[PDB]
Design a protein around this ligand. Structure first.
Ligand code: Q0W
Length: 295
């Protein structure tokens, strides 16, 4: 018999993910069906989003050869029925206070930093780059969490050294670029560009570096349709563009310029978005989401 979620201690709330203590050495990492757009957690959940993103993370953990925090199978008996398929039993780590970001393409705050300074996170780049320009080699563009509402702050390699040590910073940089490169090539082979990605790592009892959190989800990574990749313009979000377009379209009644919370989504937009998540998962993994476990 699976335990109730109420049997575990809630330790951390993200906007979209939850974390619970299972015992002294294990956590329960829970994805919800909540979706964020324009830095708002929207009223309307995307059905099965938590399950699909959990399935995606599990796929990529298996694709990569590096140590990760998974501590049991997706149907581990310690996982409550209520969160089955969207929760993982993981090893408790000492988390390193660095957002480990790799960028294979120049967009978002990376592009903005470049347009302001000619550099991103200490990397002085060629002149003449622009929106969605390919970056070769991919860049390690680390960041640190800021206050509750604020975006992460981009920092350079020296900042990472000061946070975790010189040898460890080297290790973070190398592993971040290595696993990003591997996953990005895999996805592109299936017609999806992983434009960038954000990792969190922790350290286990033996001092080993361990990949944690979620990996290569469309929340942790910019997913693009490769078939429509066009450097020089903003690429559509593979998963979130229907949501973005509706929210900023004539039917929402919402003004994004106002920092007022957005209205709920049409059911059909939520269902369409769910479909996009399933398509991305199935294309990348070569698996069927209908086989993924659930309540
Ligand atoms: C919800 C984001 N978050 C994850 C942790 C964490 N902490 C300790 N050990 C771990 N494996 C993890 C993970 N994943 C702390 N915040």
């Amino acid at each position: 018999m699976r335990p109730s979620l109420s049997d575990y201690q809630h330790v951390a709330s993200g906007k979209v993910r939850e974390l619970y203590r299972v015992d002294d050495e294990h956590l329960l990492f829970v994805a919800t069906d909540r979706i964020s757009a324009f830095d708002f957690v929207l009223d309307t959940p995307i059905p099965d989003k938590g399950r699909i993103l959990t399935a995606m993370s599990v796929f990529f953990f298996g694709l990569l050869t590096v140590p990760n925090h998974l501590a049991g199978p997706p149907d581990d008996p310690r996982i409550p029925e209520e969160v089955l398929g969207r929760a993982l039993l993981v090893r408790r780590l000492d988390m390193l206070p660095v957002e480990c970001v790799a960028r294979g393409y120049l967009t978002g705050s990376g592009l903005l930093d470049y347009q302001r300074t000619g550099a991103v996170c200490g990397h002085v780049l060629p002149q003449g780059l622009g929106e969605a320009s390919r970056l070769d080699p991919p860049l390690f563009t680390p960041a640190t969490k800021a206050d509750i509402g604020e975006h992460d702050m981009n920092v350079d390699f020296a900042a990472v050294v000061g946070l975790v040590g010189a040898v460890r910073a080297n290790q973070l940089r190398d592993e971040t670029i290595k696993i990003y490169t591997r996953a990005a090539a895999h996805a592109l082979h299936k017609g999806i560009i992983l434009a960038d990605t954000k990792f969190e790592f922790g350290v286990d009892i033996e001092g080993n570096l361990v990949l944690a959190d979620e990996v290569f989800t469309p929340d942790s990574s910019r997913y693009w349709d490769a078939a429509h990749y066009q450097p020089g313009v903003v690429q559509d979000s593979f998963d979130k563009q229907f949501v973005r377009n509706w929210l900023t379209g004539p039917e929402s009644g919402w003004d994004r310029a106002s920092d007022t919370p957005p209205p709920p989504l049409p059911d059909e937009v939520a269902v369409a978005t769910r479909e996009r998540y399933i398509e991305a998962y199935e294309r990348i993994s070569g698996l069927s989401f209908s086989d993924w476990i659930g309540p």
